[PDB]
Amino acid sequence: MFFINILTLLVPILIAMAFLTLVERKILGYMQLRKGPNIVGPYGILQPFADAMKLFMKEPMRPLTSMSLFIIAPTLSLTLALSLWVPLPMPHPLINLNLGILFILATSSLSVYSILWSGWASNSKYSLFGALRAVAQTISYEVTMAIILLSVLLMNGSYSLQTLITTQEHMWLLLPAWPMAMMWFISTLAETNRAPFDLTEGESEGFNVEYAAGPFALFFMAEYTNIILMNALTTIIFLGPLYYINLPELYSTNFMMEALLLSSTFLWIRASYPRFRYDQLMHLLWKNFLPLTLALCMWHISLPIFTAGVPPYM
């Protein structure tokens, strides 16, 4: 069985990953007074499969470059992103890990390399400049991203994502800790290099510059799967879907609904906002958010103690 449970939890996500690009190229469209892709297939449903086939068939030109730090980079990007769905706790998870959120934080952190490796591998100036800035904001955002989670955990009692289903049986962790949700949402927007915070690989063509066909696709796939995963982590950590032990799927049904809406939100954010400047972006995290996060981090070590609410381990 366990193998079947690996197809499910993977394919299903890959098929959904494909349908996100479509729901991105249509929701951005109607917002901009245009139908979007509807001519290939019925209502554009076959559109994601079509360019996938075009991308893989086109020549994967190897520049006159490394040949490994070039092919390792997309493999790593897809591998980490699809891997991080392993411990996610939809209803009950596939591989329940006692230190689950540290797994998600660590696996995300590893993706910054793929950007670094691809930028060095390309051996062209646009790629290296883009990679250095890209690596900078990714790890810069990781620092507030991690502290925001540590505040959460201390009110959850453990690192296991499964505990939050029992923590959020009466109220979402948005009500409490909303100030961080916002700061988790903005950090989720930075770490998926989505719009407001998408300076790398902008209209300025960073680490796709030299990447075409199959390599382009793999990161590509990775980004979008991440786009979902991070949104899904928002939908478990802060928006806690109702859980009934008798019927486990209403948890997944609402997880489905909240994840799609917050996934819709970063699509909506992209069309709505101009992109921030490179330093504007770091100015936000180190000046605007990190002092807010570190202080609210202390408030979340104090809220438990003097409100005699220290969370139950386990």
Partner 1 sequence: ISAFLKNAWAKEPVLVVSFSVWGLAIIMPMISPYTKYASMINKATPYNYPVPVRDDGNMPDVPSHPQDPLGPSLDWLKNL
Partner 2 sequence: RSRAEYVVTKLDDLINWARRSSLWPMTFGLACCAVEMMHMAAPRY
Partner 3 sequence: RMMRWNQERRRLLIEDLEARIALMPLFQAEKDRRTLQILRENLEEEAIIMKDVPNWKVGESVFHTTRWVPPLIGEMYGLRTKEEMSNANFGFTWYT
Evaluate whether 52 touches 18 at the Cβ level (below 8 Å).
Answer: yes
With CB under 5 to 8 Å by kind, the binding choice for 299 among partner 3, partner 1, partner 2, none is partner 1
Binding residue for ligand 3PE, selected from 12, 30, 46, 98, defined by CB under 6 A: 98
Size of the site for ligand PC1 (CB under 6 A): 5
273-312 residues near partner 1, rule: CB under 8 A: 287-289, 291-292, 294-296, 298-299, 301-308, 310, 312
With CB under 5 to 8 Å by kind, the binding choice for 99 among ligand 3PE, partner 1, partner 2, none is ligand 3PE
64 binds ligand PC1 (CB under 6 A): no
Distance between CA atoms of residues 120 and 115, nearest Å:
9
Evaluate whether 290 touches 282 at the Cβ level (below 8 Å).
Answer: no
**Which is closer to partner 2, CB of 1 or CB of 33?**
33
Binding residue for ligand 3PE, selected from 261, 291, 299, 310, defined by CB under 6 A: 291
Size of the site for partner 1 (CB under 8 A): 20
Among the listed residues 94, 99, 230, 97, the one whose alpha carbon sits nearest the alpha carbon of residue 157: 99
Q: Count CB-CB contacts under 10 A for residue 180.
A: 27
Evaluate whether 216 touches 208 at the Cβ level (below 8 Å).
Answer: yes
Residue 290: both structure tokens together: 């990190």
301 binds ligand 3PE (CB under 6 A): no
Show me where the chain is broken: residue before each gap, C-N > 2.5 A.
64, 205
Evaluate whether 223 touches 189 at the Cβ level (below 8 Å).
Answer: no
Residues in contact with ligand PC1 by CB under 6 A are 66-69, 72
Residues in contact with partner 2 by CB under 8 A are 32-34, 40, 46-47, 50-51, 53-54, 57
